[PDB]
Write an enzyme that holds these catalytic residues in place. Structure first.
Site, PDB file in Angstrom:
ATOM      1  N   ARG B  88       0.826  -1.136   0.000  1.00 12.25           N
ATOM      2  CA  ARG B  88       0.000   0.000   0.000  1.00 12.25           C
ATOM      3  C   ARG B  88       0.919   1.263   0.000  1.00 12.25           C
ATOM      4  O   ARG B  88       1.645   1.494   0.948  1.00 12.25           O
ATOM      5  CB  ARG B  88      -0.976   0.023   1.193  1.00 12.25           C
ATOM      6  CG  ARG B  88      -1.790   1.262   1.196  1.00 12.25           C
ATOM      7  CD  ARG B  88      -2.540   1.511   2.576  1.00 12.25           C
ATOM      8  NE  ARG B  88      -3.105   2.861   2.603  1.00 12.25           N
ATOM      9  CZ  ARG B  88      -3.004   3.692   3.637  1.00 12.25           C
ATOM     10  NH1 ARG B  88      -2.349   3.308   4.796  1.00 12.25           N
ATOM     11  NH2 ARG B  88      -3.495   4.905   3.512  1.00 12.25           N
ATOM     12  N   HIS B 132      -2.580  11.577   0.415  1.00 14.70           N
ATOM     13  CA  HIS B 132      -2.108  11.269   1.751  1.00 14.70           C
ATOM     14  C   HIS B 132      -1.519  12.557   2.327  1.00 14.70           C
ATOM     15  O   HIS B 132      -0.317  12.597   2.635  1.00 14.70           O
ATOM     16  CB  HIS B 132      -1.056  10.148   1.676  1.00 14.70           C
ATOM     17  CG  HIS B 132      -0.814   9.411   2.952  1.00 14.70           C
ATOM     18  ND1 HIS B 132      -0.422  10.030   4.132  1.00 14.70           N
ATOM     19  CD2 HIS B 132      -0.967   8.081   3.251  1.00 14.70           C
ATOM     20  CE1 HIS B 132      -0.311   9.118   5.103  1.00 14.70           C
ATOM     21  NE2 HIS B 132      -0.639   7.935   4.591  1.00 14.70           N
ATOM     22  N   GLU B 178      -6.692   8.880   6.432  1.00 12.32           N
ATOM     23  CA  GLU B 178      -6.919   9.493   7.723  1.00 12.32           C
ATOM     24  C   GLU B 178      -7.515  10.931   7.725  1.00 12.32           C
ATOM     25  O   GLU B 178      -6.920  11.868   8.250  1.00 12.32           O
ATOM     26  CB  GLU B 178      -5.581   9.483   8.522  1.00 12.32           C
ATOM     27  CG  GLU B 178      -5.012   8.069   8.696  1.00 12.32           C
ATOM     28  CD  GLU B 178      -3.967   7.972   9.806  1.00 12.32           C
ATOM     29  OE1 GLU B 178      -3.696   8.968  10.465  1.00 12.32           O
ATOM     30  OE2 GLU B 178      -3.412   6.845  10.018  1.00 12.32           O
ATOM     31  N   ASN B 319      -6.873   2.240  10.040  1.00 10.46           N
ATOM     32  CA  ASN B 319      -5.451   2.454  10.490  1.00 10.46           C
ATOM     33  C   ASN B 319      -5.549   2.471  12.030  1.00 10.46           C
ATOM     34  O   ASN B 319      -5.981   3.445  12.609  1.00 10.46           O
ATOM     35  CB  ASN B 319      -4.959   3.820   9.966  1.00 10.46           C
ATOM     36  CG  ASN B 319      -4.787   3.850   8.535  1.00 10.46           C
ATOM     37  OD1 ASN B 319      -4.923   2.830   7.842  1.00 10.46           O
ATOM     38  ND2 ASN B 319      -4.431   5.062   7.979  1.00 10.46           N
ATOM     39  N   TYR B 321      -3.732   1.873  15.856  1.00  4.35           N
ATOM     40  CA  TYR B 321      -2.532   1.795  16.629  1.00  4.35           C
ATOM     41  C   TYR B 321      -2.750   1.567  18.097  1.00  4.35           C
ATOM     42  O   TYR B 321      -1.970   0.863  18.747  1.00  4.35           O
ATOM     43  CB  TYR B 321      -1.675   3.142  16.454  1.00  4.35           C
ATOM     44  CG  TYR B 321      -1.207   3.320  15.045  1.00  4.35           C
ATOM     45  CD1 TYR B 321      -2.025   4.002  14.104  1.00  4.35           C
ATOM     46  CD2 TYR B 321       0.022   2.723  14.601  1.00  4.35           C
ATOM     47  CE1 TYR B 321      -1.556   4.146  12.731  1.00  4.35           C
ATOM     48  CE2 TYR B 321       0.469   2.867  13.293  1.00  4.35           C
ATOM     49  CZ  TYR B 321      -0.287   3.605  12.376  1.00  4.35           C
ATOM     50  OH  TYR B 321       0.146   3.743  11.095  1.00  4.35           O
ATOM     51  N   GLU B 394      -3.156   0.141   8.166  1.00  6.62           N
ATOM     52  CA  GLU B 394      -1.985   0.546   8.947  1.00  6.62           C
ATOM     53  C   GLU B 394      -2.084  -0.046  10.304  1.00  6.62           C
ATOM     54  O   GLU B 394      -3.170  -0.081  10.918  1.00  6.62           O
ATOM     55  CB  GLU B 394      -1.875   2.134   9.092  1.00  6.62           C
ATOM     56  CG  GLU B 394      -1.636   2.826   7.764  1.00  6.62           C
ATOM     57  CD  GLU B 394      -1.471   4.312   7.937  1.00  6.62           C
ATOM     58  OE1 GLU B 394      -1.248   4.741   9.093  1.00  6.62           O
ATOM     59  OE2 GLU B 394      -1.533   5.078   6.909  1.00  6.62           O
ATOM     60  N   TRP B 442       2.099  -0.786   9.219  1.00  4.07           N
ATOM     61  CA  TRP B 442       2.573   0.547   8.880  1.00  4.07           C
ATOM     62  C   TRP B 442       4.019   0.552   9.308  1.00  4.07           C
ATOM     63  O   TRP B 442       4.322   0.407  10.473  1.00  4.07           O
ATOM     64  CB  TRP B 442       1.887   1.706   9.536  1.00  4.07           C
ATOM     65  CG  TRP B 442       2.708   2.951   9.287  1.00  4.07           C
ATOM     66  CD1 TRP B 442       3.626   3.537  10.159  1.00  4.07           C
ATOM     67  CD2 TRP B 442       2.758   3.727   8.080  1.00  4.07           C
ATOM     68  NE1 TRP B 442       4.220   4.602   9.545  1.00  4.07           N
ATOM     69  CE2 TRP B 442       3.682   4.779   8.300  1.00  4.07           C
ATOM     70  CE3 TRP B 442       2.027   3.693   6.869  1.00  4.07           C
ATOM     71  CZ2 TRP B 442       3.943   5.760   7.345  1.00  4.07           C
ATOM     72  CZ3 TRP B 442       2.298   4.615   5.903  1.00  4.07           C
ATOM     73  CH2 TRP B 442       3.272   5.672   6.139  1.00  4.07           C
TER      74      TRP B 442
END
Lengths: 486, 486, 486, 486
Positions: B88, B132, B178, B319, B321, B394, B442
């Site tokens: 990606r 992005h 995002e 995404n 985390y 991600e 990511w």
């Protein structure tokens, strides 16, 4: 950071049946004082403080404590003022039989009768602990106290005297308080009277064996208990309205991390903390995990002893304060046990696999708030051990002297929040079928907290040492007054 | 303390279907360098670093980064060496259309074609992010970039150029990366390009409005997305084998404490973090909680816009985390919002009601390990939003330069353990019916981590700045090689 | 078509504990008559009927009603004949304080004492509602009644008089009845006294503001309630055996269709129908959804007010009749609220997504039978709001005058079946842990049903207007006699 | 009485994925014959039958068996005729290395190559067991076989020869078959070769130690396995498409009665039957219960050994036949272990607390039909041990020679019903998430059933000893042909 219950989550007396019993607890040594008055003989804890004062953190002792030998009427009033229905207190063996055996001390007996009659006069039910670590130093000198089989018969005689003197009014008894804590601290780390431990370890008297003496003393405690209960049921319960059992110290456990190994470690922690003495009164023998790990250091029961032990408790007390994570320890050539608690092969951690503590600290270093732990133990009693009648015979927290977050000793909102959460956890257990019959707060009044002296205050009711040992209701105590609709 | 998975808990490629896709991710600005080569025009992030260098923690910028404009073949090799099936990456708007609009830059287009053809030559599938954060500074100068409706048509033209140039080989697209992080940091705190915030707040350009600009820019992003997808479906998917969607940044949330108020706060946190942009592509409008709290600051959609937005994504990227506790904030006269994130009336806490952090810190200050949080978000997608096809676009952690617990940049066992736990959490979601189609780490390679410059390394593959930007496989990368049976 | 319970599904008194309380309810205005006798001053409802008679469907009023001012002994007998243990009735503010404030009317006070002493003489427990829409028209004239803060202190004085006059025998109180119905109908649609609504709407006095006045009046009701309870607890509960709370009107809600949007709409319907006044007495503030939607039209509480409100009810009454489907309404430029109920952005539908009505109509147009709705509300009280003690303070159906399916007013098998099903639904809630302490049927006797006059009969006991207002037991009443083992 | 599945409960190949593998199994000694042909050296089982013939119930041996050394093409045909996709067979160590070590026997190697190439020619996948109790009597004479550490390196060399000779075509291996059965019967009861047991017990050679030798031999087996797998992964899996593990014998267990003691006994039975060898390949050590009960009789692993053992199996085989009740045995002075199986302190009972047998007997005295037991073991693999890839490497029943209820050896409807129920139990486990990849029936052909000689027939395919050892399909075999759509 200390988060409290939201206002709609605060317990109401309505949450529990009419027959459910709210009370508070104390023990003889920790409140009575008058350690050598009216003929009382000395106990192992009088001797321990008098010969090894330095083993008490703040340099104090129980010679006077809350002076409840003289001010008991004030203890009764504080119970009445909070609307408590039960008072759990202990009888001082050495006050009533100065030499452990032989001639009873009338003034000793009169004292308990006065306390008992006063409770009953005020509508308070007495729950009596017969022995609370409180052993006559005359028996310690004569044969090494609980380390000798002779303690069994001597205890039986002491218990019989209690039944004859008070059994007409006292209908609820506990033979022994916290046998596991007692064996571990008195004979293993040696930080409690008589203060024994293995040579090379640091305790008052390092000439014992931290891998054997705790088990010897525990065995005699269970034999003593069995004789006393057989005696009780046979000749002191003719009306059949009296109940007898014992009170166990227990900690909740959670596996340290997500692994079957720590699941197995948790079961060994509960066996060793709770099962050590509970499984004998349930089935007549120690937990299998203990016999397999401890072998020849753990005495065998005779068939007749097993049978006398099994089903020997009408009621069981659980003294609950906190929980730990249980982390698996491997059996291997690299490792050998040094203290009796090492025989569980499970270390008690205060932080889990993510590095977080199990719950908020509440004041003294060992009491981390984790009410779930108690509900879990109560469900194990229900599902595994037959759901016998359970009383929470101790539950509470300490405020530590000098703690800057607790500058006003009466403003014990932390203790209040803790006790509310635990009462709520007992309600959870009850809603799930656990047969819990009462909740006794440890800490009727601030008292002598063994190795920590008075520096740890566990009371609902403050004892003002600067104002003549006066009883003063704390914030928590005042909440109980409303809770009990006084 | 950092506890790892036990050996029997380590993911195996077998855990997932044959069609499940393992890959890694990057974005143009963060790796390419060559910021002014072969005709590329400048972007808002070239401009932001060039005019406000001090807004980058370690004093660096993206002028060269991993120099992937020249060394892309090395990025391809590292993917092949780990056995990844997907790559990606993002297309640089300003490289392919130096002025945002108008004449395309052939050398820009050739670069992506070479990367694309090389991936395909090595059996690697390209998943392309169109935008992005990477906006042409020529459009920022001409009309304030995403703050003007004109960005909508200009994006559409850029997207069309991507479809025409690469659509014959690229079959999987993300319009935007995002949008929530972008709006919050670029226009609310102003720590990301173009660096705007309300007067009185500390950012490069405090002449914006942290209560309005984030919403204006988000609205244009969604309108831009809708036009591009309508264009795509209408004229660039004649075979019907291409898919398009967007990638959202998401955090898991747990209530701060046991209270319905924090349950409600958690729902507002998820609405604002995830629903802000997901609910529009699902139903054609923002979450109700947002419209009710934000009112006139949140633009209205026209009926035709709602209809173009609803069901506009074939695939969705998450995404993920970390997670936070969500703590309720009261609506009252005492309080007024200053940043757009305040409009949720739920503060994101790193510690819960018991004072414990939500999970172990992993290196940079904001990534606390909490894989449960991801499984929960994936079950909300399944049960609430129709279980659309989800790619974890991600997921990863940073190693921070100078951290004494991470002295060897290749020995990233912490990152490996994190990624294994998250892969395992995706497996949990799948076992419960969540339609998760892939997992992209990511961090294909260490890269320019925006405000933190290179001091935060997110790569599976190390970039040796002292050795010519050479690609060197870390421990995690080597585990993927075995995991993918290379 | 009206399907009844099968014979094995009919409630038995045995289903509920010995302490569970079965009763019936009335309110002053609806039964007493004697509207100007023995010094009683006029109320807003005397004034409303006397100046806007046409706002009563059948052209009647409360001037005489069931004439319970004279025939109360007959009401007592009917309760005794059904074996009811509780009687919930209200005190007429204007009968006891003809001018709202000042000198009490002894004959007014004597009347309630006679009713109270007679109930107690027959073993019936009085549950008293202090205010039941029943406001002194002297306070309405002097400052606009509940629209002015002055009502707060005047209510407090009225409540104090009730406590002093009856508190020695009455131990269970409700400060206010149905604040939500009252605010909505009195100040929003304006169909109830004083009959206010926004200009342009059709009510007796279209000079109010349907978007503000309902909230102003609700705020003063909650402030009034807080003062009265603080006064009560402080100086009128010295024995601690008295309880006080309020009674809420509530409707059950089900999502209109299978969509998260209607799930969210249902939560806003319950917040607005129930939480409007319940969440303030629970946590000291309105529901968050209401503050966010209503903003400046919803007054703020001071810290001291929040604290006085939180935990202010010992008991809560729920008046339940029916349920609705809740259908989501979008926030948008096209739509603006006109009535206060529009601020929920959830329309109450009688039919769901499949076109079916929620349950069978029972006689009057708004009471559709849906007992599940009540069990659901009771489980929300248990799980969300702390399971406070709940009394079903009203529950019942009307028979409508002229309905050809109800030609014999005593043969109320429909009402009997409804009440049995609801009693059974309370048993379901109890079996699931809901703390429900009693069930009071609305309708001790047919009475003045506000805007519908006597044409809607809600009684278990018929009032024969052609036979001197004689009390005659209906079929349902006769079933209660057997149910209560009379 | 033998109840069969109802017709709608019969498995269909459709129940399992396309990749799921159906096969049948044999072992070298049990079928090959030719025990001294083409240079083969003798094995411990040649020696055991040749020196202690009387230890075989029916007086037979493996000198010829099914003569598969010559008739293997017939075994291949029978697999093809049933439509089996897999053939699990073992390699005879002493055929390929007549002295255990040193010069390989080409004709031995050629034989396996011919079988392998023929399977592959017919589309059958070979799953090879390297060692199946089959130890070279030359190593037994030289150092006592598995009782000496030297076996570790010698096994490694044998395994290496297998990998080099067959690894290009054989991609699936099992290092060892049934280590628990082997240790228990060969060194504990001594009923299997080499036939050792403690003095005073009845076996061929009562000069061993039933409390030590089983553990010594098990330890060397696990060390041998670890070396071979490390060797394999390091130098014989360059394509990464080969898998290696081991096959365990396992019995299901149910608590004998409703008691926590028998719950604990069941866990010790599974640890000892299954965990003895499974937990070492999972975590690198024996089960904790075993170390605690067995102490110094159970050898310690070095750190490097633990690490080589943990995660050493790509696949695991379970050989399942039956289940038992597990009944708790007390640790006490009255009792000492005599056989190694006594160290579990749990007796395996065939009848439970109600006196009922666990399931129907199927022919030989030890195989009681209890398919639930297998589903339970498979769920323990999933939930406790990480759900590793599982193959049911053996499952089946025997028909016993002379049994009057089994007069026609081809009409094995009992065996068919058993196998269908077990296949159905594997489907249950799969539906619950267990990662089961195949089912191999034990019994491709009737063979030498160790101590029971040929009197126990386990084959799907009959071996007609009166007709030249001809292969004849039984009823079960014919059902598999239809099941596999042949």
């Amino acid at each position: 950071v200390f988060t409290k219950l939201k206002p709609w989550q605060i317990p109401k007396r309505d949450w529990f049946s009419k027959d459910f019993l709210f009370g508070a607890s104390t023990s003889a040594y920790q409140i009575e004082g008058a350690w050598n008055e009216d003929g009382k003989g000395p106990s192992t804890w009088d001797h321990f403080c008098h010969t090894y004062p330095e083993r008490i953190s703040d340099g104090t002792n129980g010679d006077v404590a809350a002076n409840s030998y003289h001010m008991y009427e004030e203890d009764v009033k504080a119970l009445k003022d909070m609307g408590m229905k039960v008072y759990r207190f202990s009888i001082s063996w050495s006050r009533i039989l100065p030499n452990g055996t032989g001639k009873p001390n009338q003034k000793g007996i009169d004292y308990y009768n006065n306390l008992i009659n006063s409770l009953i006069r005020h509508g308070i039910v007495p729950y009596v602990t017969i022995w609370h670590w409180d052993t006559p130093q005359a028996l310690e000198d004569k044969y090494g106290g609980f380390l000798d089989k002779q303690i069994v018969n001597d205890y039986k005689y002491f218990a019989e005297l209690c039944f004859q003197s008070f059994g007409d009014r006292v209908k609820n008894w506990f033979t022994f308080n916290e046998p596991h804590t007692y064996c571990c601290f008195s004979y293993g780390e040696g930080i409690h009277a008589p203060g024994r431990c293995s040579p090379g370890l640091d305790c008052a008297v390092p000439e014992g064996d931290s891998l054997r003496e705790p088990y010897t003393a525990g065995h005699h405690i269970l034999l003593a208990h069995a004789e006393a209960v057989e005696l009780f049921k046979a000749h002191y319960n003719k009306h059949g309205d009296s109940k007898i059992g014992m009170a166990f110290d227990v900690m909740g456990y959670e596996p340290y991390q997500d692994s079957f190994l720590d699941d197995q470690a948790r079961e060994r922690s509960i066996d060793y903390n709770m099962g050590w003495f509970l499984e004998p009164v349930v089935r007549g023998d120690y937990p299998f995990s203990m016999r397999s790990l401890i072998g020849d250091r753990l005495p065998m029961f005779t068939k007749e002893e097993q049978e006398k032990l099994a089903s020997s408790c009408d009621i069981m007390g659980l003294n609950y304060y906190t929980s730990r994570f249980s982390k698996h320890v491997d059996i291997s050539s690299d490792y050998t046990p040094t203290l009796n608690t090492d025989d569980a092969y499970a270390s008690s951690e205060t932080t889990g696999s993510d590095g977080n503590e199990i719950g908020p600290i509440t004041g003294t270093y060992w009491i981390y708030m984790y009410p779930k732990g108690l509900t879990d133990l109560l469900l194990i009693m229900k599902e595994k051990y037959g759901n016998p009648p359970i009383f929470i015979t101790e539950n509470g927290i300490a405020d530590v002297e000098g703690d800057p977050e607790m500058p006003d000793p009466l403003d014990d909102w932390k203790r209040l929040d803790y006790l509310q959460r635990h009462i709520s956890a007992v309600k959870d257990a009850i809603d799930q079928g656990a047969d819990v019959r009462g909740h006794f707060t440890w800490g009727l009044i601030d008292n002598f907290e063994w190795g920590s002296g008075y520096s740890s205050r566990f009371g609902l009711v403050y004892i003002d040492k600067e104002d003549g040992n006066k009883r003063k209701l704390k914030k928590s105590a005042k909440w109980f007054a409303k809770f009990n609709s006084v």
